[PDB]
Coordinates of C-alpha atoms in Angstrom, one line a residue:
Chain A
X1 CA 3.4 88.8 -128.4
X2 CA 2.8 87.5 -125.3
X3 CA 6.1 86.6 -122.7
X4 CA 6.4 83.0 -121.7
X5 CA 5.5 82.8 -118.0
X6 CA 1.6 84.0 -119.5
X7 CA 1.6 81.3 -122.4
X8 CA -0.6 79.5 -120.0
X9 CA -3.5 81.0 -119.9
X10 CA -5.6 82.6 -123.2
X11 CA -7.6 86.3 -122.9
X12 CA -10.3 87.9 -124.8
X13 CA -11.1 91.5 -123.4
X14 CA -14.8 92.1 -126.3
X15 CA -16.0 93.0 -122.8
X16 CA -19.9 92.9 -120.9
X17 CA -21.9 94.6 -118.6
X18 CA -24.8 95.4 -117.2
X19 CA -28.0 94.5 -117.5
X20 CA -30.2 97.9 -116.9
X21 CA -33.9 96.3 -115.6
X22 CA -37.3 95.1 -117.3
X23 CA -39.4 97.1 -118.2
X24 CA -36.6 100.1 -117.2
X25 CA -38.2 103.4 -119.1
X26 CA -41.5 102.8 -120.4
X27 CA -43.7 105.1 -118.9
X28 CA -40.6 108.2 -119.4
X29 CA -40.5 106.7 -123.5
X30 CA -43.8 108.0 -123.1
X31 CA -43.7 111.2 -122.4
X32 CA -40.4 112.4 -124.5
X33 CA -41.9 111.1 -127.3
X34 CA -44.7 113.6 -127.3
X35 CA -42.7 116.7 -125.7
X36 CA -43.3 120.2 -126.5
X37 CA -40.1 121.7 -126.9
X38 CA -39.9 124.7 -125.5
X39 CA -36.9 127.5 -125.0
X40 CA -33.8 127.1 -122.9
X41 CA -34.5 130.4 -120.2
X42 CA -38.4 130.0 -119.3
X43 CA -37.8 128.5 -115.9
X44 CA -41.7 128.7 -115.3
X45 CA -44.8 127.3 -117.9
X46 CA -48.0 129.0 -117.5
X47 CA -50.9 126.7 -118.7
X48 CA -54.0 128.6 -119.5
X49 CA -57.6 126.7 -118.3
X50 CA -60.7 128.3 -118.5
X51 CA -64.4 127.3 -117.9
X52 CA -67.9 126.3 -119.1
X53 CA -70.7 128.5 -118.6
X54 CA -74.3 129.4 -120.0
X55 CA -77.9 130.8 -119.7
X56 CA -81.6 129.1 -121.6
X57 CA -84.1 131.2 -121.2
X58 CA -86.9 128.6 -123.0
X59 CA -90.3 129.7 -124.3
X60 CA -93.0 128.8 -126.3
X61 CA -93.5 132.1 -129.2
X62 CA -89.5 133.1 -128.9
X63 CA -89.5 136.4 -127.7
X64 CA -88.5 136.7 -124.3
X65 CA -85.5 138.2 -123.0
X66 CA -82.4 136.3 -124.1
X67 CA -79.3 136.3 -121.2
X68 CA -76.0 136.1 -121.7
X69 CA -72.7 135.1 -119.4
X70 CA -69.2 134.5 -120.1
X71 CA -66.2 132.6 -119.0
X72 CA -63.6 133.2 -116.8
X73 CA -60.3 131.7 -116.5
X74 CA -57.4 130.2 -114.0
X75 CA -53.4 128.9 -114.6
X76 CA -51.2 125.9 -113.6
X77 CA -48.2 126.0 -113.4
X78 CA -45.1 124.5 -113.8
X79 CA -40.9 124.0 -113.6
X80 CA -38.0 123.6 -116.0
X81 CA -34.3 122.6 -114.3
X82 CA -31.0 120.9 -116.3
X83 CA -29.7 117.6 -115.2
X84 CA -25.7 117.4 -115.9
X85 CA -23.0 114.5 -116.0
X86 CA -19.2 114.3 -117.1
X87 CA -16.5 111.6 -117.2
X88 CA -13.0 111.2 -118.8
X89 CA -10.2 109.6 -118.5
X90 CA -6.6 110.7 -118.2
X91 CA -3.5 111.2 -120.7
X92 CA -0.2 108.1 -120.2
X93 CA -3.9 105.5 -120.3
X94 CA -5.8 106.7 -122.9
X95 CA -2.8 106.9 -125.5
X96 CA -1.8 103.5 -124.2
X97 CA -5.6 102.4 -124.4
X98 CA -5.7 103.5 -128.5
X99 CA -2.6 100.7 -129.3
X100 CA -5.0 97.6 -128.4
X101 CA -7.9 98.7 -129.6
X102 CA -9.8 98.2 -126.9
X103 CA -12.4 101.4 -126.6
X104 CA -13.2 102.4 -122.9
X105 CA -14.4 105.8 -124.3
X106 CA -17.1 105.3 -126.7
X107 CA -18.4 102.4 -123.9
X108 CA -18.5 105.3 -121.4
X109 CA -20.5 107.2 -123.7
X110 CA -23.0 105.1 -124.1
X111 CA -22.7 103.7 -120.2
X112 CA -22.8 107.5 -118.4
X113 CA -26.3 108.3 -120.9
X114 CA -27.6 105.0 -118.5
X115 CA -27.3 106.9 -115.6
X116 CA -27.8 111.1 -116.7
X117 CA -31.6 109.7 -117.5
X118 CA -32.0 107.7 -114.3
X119 CA -31.8 110.5 -111.8
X120 CA -34.6 111.8 -114.8
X121 CA -36.4 108.8 -113.9
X122 CA -35.5 109.4 -110.5
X123 CA -37.1 113.0 -110.8
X124 CA -40.7 112.4 -112.4
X125 CA -40.7 109.4 -109.5
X126 CA -40.2 111.2 -106.6
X127 CA -39.2 115.4 -107.1
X128 CA -36.2 117.1 -104.7
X129 CA -37.8 119.6 -102.8
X130 CA -35.4 122.1 -103.5
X131 CA -36.3 123.2 -107.7
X132 CA -38.3 125.7 -106.5
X133 CA -39.6 129.1 -108.6
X134 CA -42.4 130.9 -107.3
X135 CA -45.0 127.8 -106.1
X136 CA -44.2 124.9 -108.4
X137 CA -42.7 122.3 -107.0
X138 CA -43.1 119.2 -108.6
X139 CA -42.9 116.1 -105.8
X140 CA -43.0 113.1 -107.7
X141 CA -45.9 111.1 -109.0
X142 CA -46.2 109.4 -106.4
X143 CA -46.1 112.5 -103.2
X144 CA -48.1 115.2 -105.7
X145 CA -50.7 117.3 -104.2
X146 CA -51.8 116.8 -108.0
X147 CA -52.0 112.9 -108.3
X148 CA -54.9 111.4 -106.7
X149 CA -54.4 109.2 -103.4
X150 CA -56.2 105.6 -103.7
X151 CA -55.2 102.7 -101.2
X152 CA -55.7 100.1 -102.3
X153 CA -57.8 96.6 -100.3
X154 CA -56.4 93.2 -101.2
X155 CA -53.5 93.1 -102.0
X156 CA -52.7 92.4 -106.3
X157 CA -49.8 89.6 -105.6
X158 CA -51.9 86.8 -104.0
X159 CA -55.4 87.3 -104.9
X160 CA -57.9 85.4 -107.3
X161 CA -58.6 86.5 -110.3
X162 CA -62.0 88.0 -109.4
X163 CA -60.6 89.6 -106.7
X164 CA -58.4 92.1 -109.5
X165 CA -60.8 93.3 -111.7
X166 CA -63.3 94.0 -108.7
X167 CA -60.0 96.0 -106.8
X168 CA -59.5 97.8 -111.4
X169 CA -62.5 98.6 -111.5
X170 CA -62.4 100.6 -108.0
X171 CA -59.2 102.1 -109.2
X172 CA -60.2 103.2 -112.5
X173 CA -63.6 104.7 -110.3
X174 CA -61.3 107.1 -109.6
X175 CA -60.9 109.2 -112.9
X176 CA -64.7 108.6 -114.2
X177 CA -67.0 109.2 -111.5
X178 CA -64.9 111.4 -109.0
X179 CA -63.0 113.4 -111.2
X180 CA -65.0 113.2 -114.3
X181 CA -62.4 112.4 -117.0
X182 CA -63.2 110.8 -120.0
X183 CA -61.1 109.8 -122.8
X184 CA -58.1 106.6 -123.8
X185 CA -56.9 105.2 -120.2
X186 CA -52.8 103.8 -120.0
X187 CA -52.0 101.3 -116.5
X188 CA -49.0 101.1 -115.3
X189 CA -47.6 97.8 -112.3
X190 CA -44.7 96.8 -110.5
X191 CA -42.9 94.5 -111.7
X192 CA -43.8 91.4 -108.5
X193 CA -47.5 92.0 -110.0
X194 CA -47.1 91.8 -113.4
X195 CA -44.7 88.4 -112.3
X196 CA -48.2 87.5 -110.2
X197 CA -50.3 87.9 -112.8
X198 CA -50.0 84.4 -114.4
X199 CA -50.6 82.5 -111.6
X200 CA -53.6 80.2 -112.8
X201 CA -56.8 82.0 -112.7
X202 CA -59.7 79.9 -111.1
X203 CA -62.7 80.9 -113.3
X204 CA -61.9 80.4 -116.2
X205 CA -61.5 75.4 -116.8
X206 CA -60.8 75.6 -120.6
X207 CA -57.4 74.9 -119.9
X208 CA -54.9 77.0 -118.5
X209 CA -54.9 81.3 -118.6
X210 CA -53.1 83.7 -116.1
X211 CA -54.7 86.8 -114.9
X212 CA -52.9 89.7 -117.4
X213 CA -54.9 87.4 -120.6
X214 CA -58.2 88.2 -118.1
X215 CA -57.2 92.1 -117.9
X216 CA -56.7 92.4 -121.8
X217 CA -59.8 91.4 -122.7
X218 CA -61.7 92.3 -119.5
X219 CA -60.9 95.8 -119.6
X220 CA -60.8 96.9 -123.1
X221 CA -60.4 100.6 -122.7
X222 CA -56.9 100.7 -121.6
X223 CA -54.4 101.9 -124.3
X224 CA -50.9 99.3 -122.4
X225 CA -50.7 97.9 -119.6
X226 CA -46.8 97.4 -119.0
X227 CA -44.7 97.3 -116.3
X228 CA -42.2 100.1 -114.3
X229 CA -39.8 99.6 -112.3
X230 CA -40.1 102.8 -110.1
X231 CA -42.8 100.9 -108.2
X232 CA -42.0 98.3 -106.3
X233 CA -44.5 95.5 -104.6
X234 CA -48.1 96.5 -104.3
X235 CA -48.3 98.9 -106.2
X236 CA -50.0 100.4 -109.8
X237 CA -50.4 103.9 -111.6
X238 CA -53.7 104.2 -114.3
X239 CA -53.8 107.8 -115.7
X240 CA -53.7 109.5 -119.1
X241 CA -50.9 110.7 -121.2
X242 CA -51.1 113.1 -124.0
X243 CA -51.3 116.7 -124.0
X244 CA -55.0 116.9 -121.5
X245 CA -52.8 115.0 -119.0
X246 CA -49.7 113.8 -118.0
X247 CA -47.5 115.2 -120.4
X248 CA -43.6 116.4 -120.3
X249 CA -41.8 120.4 -121.9
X250 CA -38.4 119.6 -123.1
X251 CA -35.8 122.7 -123.0
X252 CA -32.9 121.6 -124.7
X253 CA -33.2 118.5 -126.3
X254 CA -30.1 115.8 -124.7
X255 CA -27.0 116.7 -126.8
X256 CA -22.9 116.4 -125.7
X257 CA -19.6 118.4 -126.3
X258 CA -15.8 117.9 -126.3
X259 CA -14.6 120.2 -123.4
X260 CA -11.1 121.4 -125.5
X261 CA -6.9 120.8 -124.5
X262 CA -4.4 122.9 -124.3
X263 CA -1.9 121.7 -123.6
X264 CA -0.5 118.5 -124.4
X265 CA -1.0 116.6 -121.1
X266 CA -4.9 118.0 -121.1
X267 CA -7.2 114.9 -120.0
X268 CA -10.2 114.1 -122.1
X269 CA -12.8 115.2 -120.9
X270 CA -16.9 115.5 -122.7
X271 CA -20.1 116.2 -121.0
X272 CA -23.1 115.4 -121.3
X273 CA -26.6 117.7 -120.5
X274 CA -30.7 118.1 -120.8
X275 CA -33.5 120.0 -119.2
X276 CA -37.3 119.0 -118.9
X277 CA -40.2 119.3 -116.7
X278 CA -43.0 117.1 -115.7
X279 CA -46.8 118.2 -114.9
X280 CA -50.5 116.7 -114.6
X281 CA -52.9 118.4 -115.7
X282 CA -55.5 120.0 -113.5
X283 CA -58.9 121.8 -114.3
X284 CA -60.5 124.9 -113.7
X285 CA -63.0 123.2 -111.0
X286 CA -60.7 121.5 -109.8
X287 CA -60.7 118.3 -111.1
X288 CA -57.3 115.9 -111.0
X289 CA -56.2 113.3 -113.7
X290 CA -53.8 110.8 -112.4
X291 CA -54.4 107.9 -110.1
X292 CA -51.7 106.2 -108.7
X293 CA -52.7 103.0 -106.2
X294 CA -51.0 103.2 -102.7
Chain B
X1 CA -24.1 102.4 -106.2
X2 CA -25.2 105.6 -108.0
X3 CA -21.9 107.6 -106.3
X4 CA -20.0 105.7 -108.0
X5 CA -15.9 106.0 -106.4
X6 CA -13.6 105.0 -108.9
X7 CA -11.5 108.6 -109.8
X8 CA -9.8 110.1 -106.8
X9 CA -10.1 113.7 -108.9
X10 CA -13.4 114.5 -110.1
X11 CA -13.7 118.1 -109.6
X12 CA -14.6 119.6 -112.4
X13 CA -15.4 119.4 -116.1
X14 CA -13.0 121.9 -117.0
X15 CA -10.4 122.0 -114.0
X16 CA -6.7 120.2 -115.1
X17 CA -5.1 118.2 -111.7
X18 CA -1.2 118.8 -110.3
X19 CA 1.0 116.2 -110.5
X20 CA 4.1 115.5 -108.2
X21 CA 6.1 112.8 -109.2
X22 CA 8.2 110.8 -107.4
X23 CA 9.5 107.7 -106.2
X24 CA 8.3 105.3 -103.3
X25 CA 9.0 103.9 -99.7
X26 CA 6.1 101.7 -99.0
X27 CA 2.9 100.3 -100.5
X28 CA 0.5 103.0 -99.6
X29 CA -3.5 103.5 -100.8
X30 CA -4.4 105.6 -103.2
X31 CA -6.6 109.0 -101.8
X32 CA -3.7 109.1 -98.4
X33 CA -1.6 112.8 -97.5
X34 CA 1.3 112.3 -98.7
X35 CA 5.3 114.1 -97.4
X36 CA 8.2 114.4 -99.4
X37 CA 11.1 113.6 -97.8
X38 CA 14.6 113.7 -98.6
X39 CA 15.8 112.1 -102.0
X40 CA 13.4 112.0 -104.3
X41 CA 10.7 109.7 -102.2
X42 CA 7.4 109.9 -101.2
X43 CA 5.6 107.9 -98.9
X44 CA 2.5 108.5 -95.9
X45 CA 3.4 111.7 -94.0
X46 CA 3.6 110.3 -90.0
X47 CA 3.4 114.2 -88.7
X48 CA 0.7 115.0 -86.5
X49 CA -2.4 116.5 -86.2
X50 CA -1.6 119.9 -85.1
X51 CA 0.6 121.0 -87.4
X52 CA 0.7 123.5 -89.7
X53 CA 2.5 124.6 -93.4
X54 CA 1.6 121.5 -94.9
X55 CA 1.7 121.2 -98.5
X56 CA -2.7 119.5 -99.9
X57 CA -0.7 116.2 -101.5
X58 CA -2.4 113.0 -102.2
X59 CA -1.8 109.7 -103.5
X60 CA -4.1 110.0 -107.1
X61 CA -5.1 106.7 -108.1
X62 CA -2.5 104.9 -110.6
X63 CA -3.4 104.3 -114.7
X64 CA -5.6 101.7 -116.1
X65 CA -3.1 100.3 -117.7
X66 CA -0.6 100.1 -115.1
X67 CA -3.5 97.7 -112.7
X68 CA -4.4 101.0 -110.8
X69 CA -7.6 101.7 -109.3
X70 CA -9.3 103.4 -105.6
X71 CA -8.3 100.2 -103.9
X72 CA -5.3 98.6 -105.6
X73 CA -2.4 99.7 -103.5
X74 CA 0.9 101.4 -105.3
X75 CA 4.0 98.7 -105.6
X76 CA 7.1 100.3 -103.3
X77 CA 10.2 101.5 -104.1
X78 CA 8.4 102.7 -108.2
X79 CA 7.2 106.1 -109.1
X80 CA 4.2 106.8 -107.6
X81 CA 2.1 109.9 -110.0
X82 CA 0.7 111.9 -106.7
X83 CA -2.2 116.2 -106.6
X84 CA -1.9 118.8 -104.9
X85 CA -4.7 120.1 -104.7
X86 CA -5.4 123.4 -105.2
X87 CA -7.8 125.3 -103.7
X88 CA -11.3 125.2 -105.3
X89 CA -11.8 121.1 -106.4
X90 CA -13.0 118.2 -105.3
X91 CA -11.0 115.3 -105.0
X92 CA -12.3 112.1 -102.7
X93 CA -10.6 111.5 -99.5
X94 CA -9.8 109.0 -97.3
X95 CA -11.7 109.1 -93.4
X96 CA -10.1 107.3 -90.6
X97 CA -13.0 105.0 -88.2
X98 CA -16.1 106.3 -85.8
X99 CA -16.9 109.4 -87.0
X100 CA -19.6 111.1 -88.5
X101 CA -20.5 113.0 -91.1
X102 CA -23.8 115.4 -90.5
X103 CA -23.5 118.8 -92.7
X104 CA -22.2 119.9 -95.6
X105 CA -19.8 122.6 -95.0
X106 CA -17.4 120.5 -91.9
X107 CA -13.5 121.3 -91.5
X108 CA -11.1 118.6 -92.6
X109 CA -8.1 118.0 -90.6
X110 CA -5.6 115.9 -91.2
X111 CA -5.0 112.6 -88.9
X112 CA -1.3 111.2 -87.8
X113 CA -1.4 108.0 -89.8
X114 CA -1.8 109.7 -93.2
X115 CA -6.6 109.8 -92.9
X116 CA -8.3 112.1 -92.9
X117 CA -10.9 113.4 -89.4
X118 CA -13.3 115.9 -88.6
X119 CA -10.9 118.3 -85.7
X120 CA -11.7 122.0 -84.3
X121 CA -10.4 124.1 -86.8
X122 CA -8.4 126.1 -83.8
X123 CA -5.7 123.9 -82.9
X124 CA -5.1 121.9 -87.3
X125 CA -5.2 122.8 -90.2
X126 CA -8.3 122.6 -91.8
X127 CA -7.1 121.5 -96.0
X128 CA -11.2 119.9 -97.2
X129 CA -14.3 121.0 -96.6
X130 CA -16.6 117.9 -96.8
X131 CA -19.1 117.4 -99.6
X132 CA -21.5 114.1 -98.7
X133 CA -22.9 113.3 -95.8
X134 CA -22.1 110.0 -95.0
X135 CA -21.7 108.0 -91.8
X136 CA -18.1 105.9 -91.7
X137 CA -16.6 102.6 -90.0
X138 CA -14.1 101.4 -92.2
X139 CA -11.7 103.4 -92.1
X140 CA -10.1 103.7 -95.1
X141 CA -13.7 104.7 -97.0
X142 CA -13.8 107.9 -99.9
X143 CA -15.2 110.6 -99.0
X144 CA -16.4 113.7 -100.8
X145 CA -14.5 116.7 -100.1
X146 CA -14.0 120.5 -101.8
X147 CA -10.4 121.3 -101.0
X148 CA -10.9 125.1 -100.3
Chain C
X1 CA -44.6 141.9 -123.7
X2 CA -42.6 140.7 -121.2
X3 CA -41.8 143.1 -118.4
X4 CA -37.4 142.3 -117.7
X5 CA -38.6 142.0 -114.3
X6 CA -40.3 138.4 -114.8
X7 CA -39.0 137.3 -118.6
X8 CA -39.1 134.2 -116.7
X9 CA -42.0 133.3 -117.9
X10 CA -43.7 131.6 -121.0
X11 CA -47.4 132.0 -120.1
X12 CA -49.1 129.9 -123.6
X13 CA -52.4 130.6 -124.9
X14 CA -53.8 127.5 -126.3
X15 CA -56.4 126.6 -123.4
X16 CA -56.8 122.8 -122.8
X17 CA -60.5 123.0 -123.2
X18 CA -62.8 121.1 -120.5
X19 CA -63.8 117.3 -120.9
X20 CA -67.6 116.1 -121.5
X21 CA -68.4 113.5 -119.6
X22 CA -68.5 109.5 -120.8
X23 CA -72.4 109.2 -120.9
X24 CA -74.2 113.0 -120.7
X25 CA -75.9 112.9 -123.9
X26 CA -76.9 109.5 -126.0
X27 CA -80.3 109.2 -125.7
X28 CA -80.6 113.2 -127.0
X29 CA -77.7 112.1 -130.2
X30 CA -80.1 109.6 -131.0
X31 CA -83.7 111.5 -130.8
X32 CA -82.1 114.5 -132.3
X33 CA -80.4 112.5 -135.6
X34 CA -84.0 110.6 -136.2
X35 CA -86.3 113.9 -135.7
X36 CA -88.5 115.3 -138.5
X37 CA -88.4 118.1 -139.8
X38 CA -91.7 121.3 -139.5
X39 CA -92.1 124.6 -140.6
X40 CA -91.7 127.5 -137.7
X41 CA -95.0 128.4 -135.7
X42 CA -96.4 124.7 -135.5
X43 CA -97.3 125.0 -131.9
Chain D
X1 CA -21.0 157.4 -109.5
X2 CA -17.7 156.1 -111.7
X3 CA -17.2 152.9 -109.0
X4 CA -20.8 151.3 -110.1
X5 CA -21.4 148.6 -107.7
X6 CA -24.5 146.5 -108.9
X7 CA -22.7 143.1 -109.7
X8 CA -21.8 140.9 -107.0
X9 CA -18.9 139.2 -108.7
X10 CA -16.1 141.3 -110.2
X11 CA -13.3 139.6 -110.9
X12 CA -11.8 139.2 -114.1
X13 CA -12.3 139.1 -117.8
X14 CA -12.2 135.3 -118.0
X15 CA -12.5 134.2 -113.9
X16 CA -15.5 131.9 -114.2
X17 CA -17.5 132.1 -110.4
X18 CA -17.9 128.9 -108.7
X19 CA -21.7 128.4 -107.5
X20 CA -22.5 126.6 -104.3
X21 CA -26.8 125.8 -104.6
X22 CA -29.0 125.5 -101.2
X23 CA -31.9 126.7 -99.5
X24 CA -32.9 129.6 -97.6
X25 CA -33.7 130.1 -94.4
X26 CA -34.3 133.8 -94.0
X27 CA -34.2 136.8 -96.0
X28 CA -30.2 137.9 -96.4
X29 CA -29.2 140.7 -98.3
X30 CA -26.2 140.1 -101.0
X31 CA -22.7 140.4 -100.4
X32 CA -23.2 139.1 -96.2
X33 CA -20.8 135.9 -95.5
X34 CA -22.8 132.9 -95.0
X35 CA -22.5 129.1 -94.1
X36 CA -24.0 126.1 -94.6
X37 CA -26.6 123.5 -92.1
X38 CA -28.0 120.9 -91.5
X39 CA -30.7 119.0 -95.0
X40 CA -30.0 121.3 -97.9
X41 CA -30.3 125.0 -96.4
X42 CA -28.8 128.4 -95.8
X43 CA -28.6 131.1 -93.8
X44 CA -26.5 133.0 -92.3
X45 CA -23.3 132.5 -90.7
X46 CA -24.1 133.4 -86.6
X47 CA -20.4 132.2 -85.8
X48 CA -17.6 133.7 -83.9
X49 CA -15.2 135.7 -84.5
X50 CA -12.6 133.9 -83.4
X51 CA -12.5 130.9 -85.1
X52 CA -10.7 129.6 -87.7
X53 CA -12.6 126.6 -91.0
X54 CA -14.5 128.4 -91.7
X55 CA -15.0 128.2 -95.9
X56 CA -15.6 131.4 -98.0
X57 CA -19.2 131.2 -99.8
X58 CA -20.9 134.3 -100.4
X59 CA -24.3 135.5 -101.0
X60 CA -24.1 137.0 -105.0
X61 CA -27.5 138.5 -106.0
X62 CA -30.2 136.6 -107.4
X63 CA -30.7 136.9 -111.2
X64 CA -32.0 139.9 -113.5
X65 CA -34.9 137.9 -114.2
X66 CA -36.1 136.8 -110.7
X67 CA -35.9 140.6 -109.0
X68 CA -32.5 140.7 -108.3
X69 CA -30.2 143.6 -107.1
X70 CA -27.1 144.4 -105.2
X71 CA -29.7 146.1 -102.8
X72 CA -33.0 143.5 -102.9
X73 CA -32.9 141.0 -100.4
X74 CA -33.4 137.4 -101.6
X75 CA -37.1 135.7 -100.5
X76 CA -37.4 133.6 -97.2
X77 CA -37.5 129.3 -98.3
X78 CA -36.2 128.4 -101.6
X79 CA -33.3 128.2 -104.6
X80 CA -30.3 131.2 -103.3
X81 CA -27.2 131.0 -105.4
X82 CA -24.7 131.9 -103.5
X83 CA -20.8 132.1 -104.9
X84 CA -17.2 130.4 -103.3
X85 CA -14.9 132.4 -103.6
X86 CA -11.5 131.1 -105.0
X87 CA -7.8 132.7 -103.8
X88 CA -7.0 135.2 -106.5
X89 CA -11.0 137.0 -106.6
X90 CA -11.4 140.4 -106.4
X91 CA -15.9 140.3 -104.8
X92 CA -18.1 142.9 -103.7
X93 CA -17.9 142.4 -99.8
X94 CA -20.4 144.0 -97.2
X95 CA -18.8 145.6 -93.5
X96 CA -19.8 146.8 -90.7
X97 CA -20.5 150.7 -89.4
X98 CA -17.3 152.7 -87.9
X99 CA -14.7 151.2 -89.5
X100 CA -12.1 153.5 -92.3
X101 CA -9.9 152.0 -95.1
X102 CA -6.8 154.0 -95.4
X103 CA -4.4 151.1 -97.1
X104 CA -4.6 149.4 -99.8
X105 CA -4.1 145.7 -98.3
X106 CA -5.4 145.2 -94.9
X107 CA -6.5 141.9 -93.7
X108 CA -10.3 141.5 -94.0
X109 CA -11.7 139.7 -90.9
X110 CA -15.6 138.1 -90.6
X111 CA -17.8 139.9 -88.2
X112 CA -20.3 137.6 -85.9
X113 CA -23.5 138.8 -87.6
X114 CA -22.6 138.5 -91.3
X115 CA -21.0 141.4 -92.2
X116 CA -16.8 142.0 -92.5
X117 CA -14.4 144.5 -90.5
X118 CA -10.7 145.7 -90.5
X119 CA -9.3 143.2 -87.5
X120 CA -6.3 141.9 -86.4
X121 CA -4.6 139.6 -88.3
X122 CA -3.3 137.1 -85.3
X123 CA -6.3 135.5 -83.4
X124 CA -9.0 135.4 -86.1
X125 CA -9.4 133.5 -90.1
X126 CA -7.8 136.2 -92.5
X127 CA -11.0 136.4 -96.0
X128 CA -9.3 138.5 -97.6
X129 CA -8.0 142.1 -99.0
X130 CA -8.8 145.4 -99.3
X131 CA -8.5 147.3 -102.8
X132 CA -10.2 150.3 -102.3
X133 CA -10.4 153.7 -100.2
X134 CA -13.4 154.5 -98.4
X135 CA -14.8 155.5 -95.1
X136 CA -17.7 153.8 -94.1
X137 CA -20.9 154.7 -91.6
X138 CA -24.3 152.4 -92.4
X139 CA -23.6 148.9 -92.3
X140 CA -24.0 147.5 -95.1
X141 CA -22.2 149.2 -97.5
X142 CA -20.5 147.3 -100.6
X143 CA -16.4 147.5 -100.3
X144 CA -14.4 145.6 -103.0
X145 CA -12.2 143.2 -102.0
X146 CA -9.2 140.9 -103.4
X147 CA -9.6 137.0 -102.6
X148 CA -6.3 136.3 -101.7

């Protein structure tokens, strides 16, 4: 029960934490679901790329010396680092909180695991220049030399409906024209643009429609158009996902264990760890496959 | 804040701490330098900065089930649960004002008021070694340091 | 395989091909599907 | 050779090492004294011999699967895996030239070039204690020492 100096208040310790973000891990949720699993210890993963080759002779009869050629090969490098994190309480506290049925441990395993993936999400968009084996840095999706840089001209937060599609095709043509890539694309936006793609479309007058519904009909060759909070402001990103484009390789899947207690007053401790790596594709002639807008 | 600082002993996932219980004399904040006195009471050190032979004794945060945190001061005249720091562990200390930590690995001396400072390691006892590049301006900020 | 000086490189042997163009052989793909087959020798 | 010296951390069968990663600046040999600098880069110490407060930070041998041994120098501008030495472990240091180790238990100071020497323990920081009776003449020989 309670005392007599505490009969003026009723409590309820059900607890409610924070909400994460809006479009938090949409890109990383797609990469880690199509990932290839390699063995741990393999720090560098070399993938081979080959060429095109051929000679063709022609005549009207069919008896001429037929020529020959063959294909070359080259290689590309990625890297696999290891992430880890832990949490823990003391001895007198956790035995006190076991009686009150306040959990305070399972509501920490569901909390470090979010902060664990945040630094991987930081690594994917900002590669720290201190995990390098021979030449296999990553650098990040907005500073790498394996990512095509394209500067936007018009601000996509204040522009009309017409300047959006006129400056979204100029982004897609750094993948169809000057880089020769094909196949199904994907598009990712900052929330400062996905919010501002709800204003009035000046062209269509049959009621009221937003700019976002004028890109999900005008550009049908787009698999998903989602938001991701790693970009901020006037910046977008269009690329290919899958084994022929932006891909990920998982070293060790996310596992957890408990440090065992020896004495009677050993504190409770738990450890979660994870290991994977990222790389964008690059063909043998050197044709990039991801474009980062501004 | 990606660097959450709500536990004063963050020093590895397999290293347990060494605890020195005792009585209180004042109301100090967790993460300050202590010194045991006559009877069985602990308080702030209040020794000189240029005196060697002092034991690495910092104030652990109090338990969660007693109203304890990394900023809640202790209640006077009670049992204060402290920490004796072994060499080779990371602990959150508490620095004084107007000093910036540039390089990971500077010497951590002890100020006379119970806080720490970056001093020259030729006339004062070196307790720990810095492990975080931040700049502090208000006295009482928690900075990660390795105790070797 | 894998000299123990290195032993740290999972070298893969897939290839990951080479992509086509978008509109490479659209006309010729229609002509050669409606073509009449004659005998060889008829020049 | 009955005393094989092909691993720089030989300090017990139950004691694990404490590792401090970081970037390189030069090409040093494993077993030399290091000092962390600005940014996140490590190199040789190049401090004075009569300066206290330095951390016991030696260069671990690189992994076998990266071309690493006890005499292979590190490659510059890369990740050098180092060792912070806890008190009470044995490690293979690297001494300078023209000094003989007679008694097990002398004081091990630090030379200014990144190697170690037998100095007088009254004006320099004592890092470790000798544990092998050999005489060295070429600078860069591995001598077993206990870190207390």
